[PDB]
Design a protein around this ligand. Structure first.
Ligand code: AR6
Ligand code: PCA
Ligand code: ZN
Length: 282
């Protein structure tokens, strides 16, 4: 908590000017079209447009903490709506243009967005998910599980067990869930396009996964307002708001960003939906 390295916090924001931004979002378009296996990696930056502050941005939790100030939340976790970005990733999965989604976010919004859990690795866990210590059954709740650091919640497993239910929020010392990390790693290795959205890429091994795609000749796209640990290993860096980038991209892709019907949980990815015919690229 005190000994914890919170990495580089408060680094200046970069804003690509409009014409560099329009060109970079078309190139990202081209790369989605060109790619067989696309993995998205998300961090706290995709939730700030929902009122949830990030960790290391100008008003990040750790950033403000360093300057003796407090993060501000403009919502509760329960009343937080998924962003245009969140709902773009749902539609990209539904049309078969997103193979796997890796998130370091505990804010619960990917799942609440209707995003299929069998295509999602939540590397730092989920505020709404408790897990039985025995059968390992996960309960996705409507309100945040009131503990952090993998403690007893109070409730017991109800599988046809009475096992002690614990939060999925990793403490500083707790290693990542093996299943989620294993699937996030395999997806990242096999990807030919890893795209990062609103992460500074500073936490091992979460931040390193997008680099594995680069091995084997995979392309790496970083989308982030601030520099990030692996900017140098990126084939494309887009310095702008992810909502704006993802709305331009979906628009280039011929895709609608679907309505969020409110909190819904989808265990398994449904069969893929029609998508637009691809442009002639080369
Ligand atoms: N609307 C936006 N559009 C684009 N980028 C944004 C936006 N808002 C913020 N950013 C950028 O988004 C980036 C967010 O980076 P960080 O704040 O480190 O969050 P993490 O997900 O990487 O933190 C990882 C873990 O570390 C913690 O200890 C917890 O365990 C976390 O799970 C910044 O560079 C912002 O400039
Ligand atoms: O508990 C917290 C503090 C910051 C917020 C987030 O997901 O960014 N989660
Ligand atoms: Zn159980």
């Amino acid at each position: 908590p005190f000994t914890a390295d919170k990495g580089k916090c408060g680094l200046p924001e970069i804003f690509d000017p409009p014409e560099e931004l329009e060109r970079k979002v078309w190139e990202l378009a081209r790369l989605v079209w060109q790619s067989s296996s696309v993995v998205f990696h998300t961090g706290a930056g995709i939730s700030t447009a929902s009122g949830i502050p990030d960790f290391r941005g100008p008003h990040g939790v750790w950033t403000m903490e360093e300057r003796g100030l407090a993060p501000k939340f403009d919502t509760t976790f329960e009343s937080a709506r998924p962003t245009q970005t969140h709902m773009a990733l749902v539609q990209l999965e539904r049309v078969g243009l997103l193979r796997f989604l890796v998130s370091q976010n505990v804010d619960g919004l990917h799942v609440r967005s209707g995003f299929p859990r069998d295509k999602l690795a939540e590397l730092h866990g989920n505020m709404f998910v408790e897990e039985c210590a025995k059968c390992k059954t996960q309960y996705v709740r409507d309100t945040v599980v009131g503990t952090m650091g993998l403690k007893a919640t109070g409730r017991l497993c109800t599988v046809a067990c009475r096992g002690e239910l614990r939060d999925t929020i990793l403490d500083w010392e707790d290693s990542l869930p093996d299943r989620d990390l294993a699937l996030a790693d395999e997806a990242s290795r096999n990807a030919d396009l890893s795209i990062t959205l609103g992460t500074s890429l500073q936490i091992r091994p979460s931040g390193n996964l997008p680099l594995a795609t680069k091995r084997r000749g995979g392309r790496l796209v970083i989308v982030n307002l601030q520099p990030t640990k692996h900017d140098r290993h990126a084939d494309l860096r887009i310095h702008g708001y992810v909502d704006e980038v993802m709305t331009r991209l979906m628009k280039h892709l011929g895709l609608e960003i679907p309505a969020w019907d409110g909190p819904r949980v989808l265990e398994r990815a449904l069969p893929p939906l029609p998508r637009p015919p691809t442009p002639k690229l080369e």
